[PDB]
Amino acid sequence: AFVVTDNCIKCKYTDCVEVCPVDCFYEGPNFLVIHPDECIDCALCEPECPAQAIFSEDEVPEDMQEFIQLNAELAEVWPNITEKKDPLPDAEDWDGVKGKLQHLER
Ligand code: SF4
Ligand code: F3S
């Protein structure tokens, strides 16, 4: 699996969904997640994210390890997203701010 990590939150550009061949992104109000059993590890989403928030599971930084289980959990509960949409309004303001997990909305 690939995994969405902290910098997506309050950015949610949604560029990643457009290259996914298996439609395995699931949508929250201010974040996306990857369903790990559906993901085929094609790696195509990784370079598309402007937030650079996506990592191979085995490359998730130590300080963002909690995101691996969090993607698995939220992928079960959130609706599928398969089309690009506008980024969140103040995305540029939040891109690169750390610790945005505190702002995650269910
Ligand atoms: S690695 Fe491929 S299959 Fe997995 S989420 Fe990214 S684009 Fe979709
Ligand atoms: S910000 Fe989030 S919505 Fe996709 S393009 Fe990046 S993982």
UniProtKB/Swiss-Prot annotation:
Keywords assigned by UniProt, alphabetized: 3Fe-4S, 4Fe-4S, DNA-binding, Electron transport, Iron, Iron-sulfur, Metal-binding, Repeat, Transport
Cofactor(s) listed in the protein's UniProt record: [4Fe-4S] cluster; [3Fe-4S] cluster
Start-end of Basic and acidic residues biased regions: 95-106
Origin superkingdom: Bacteria
InterPro entries membership: 4Fe4S_Fe-S-bd, 4Fe4S_Fe_S_CS, 7Fe_ferredoxin, Fd_C, FdxA, RnfB_subfamily
Residues annotated as binding [4Fe-4S] cluster: 20, 39, 42, 45
GO molecular function, one term: 3 iron, 4 sulfur cluster binding
Listed transmembrane segments: none
Database matches in NCBIfam families: FdxA_Protbact
UniProt function note: Ferredoxins are iron-sulfur proteins that transfer electrons in a wide variety of metabolic reactions. This ferredoxin could play a role in regulating gene expression by interacting directly with DNA.
Name of the protein this chain belongs to: Ferredoxin-1
The species this protein was found in: Azotobacter vinelandii
Gene symbol of the encoding locus: fdxA
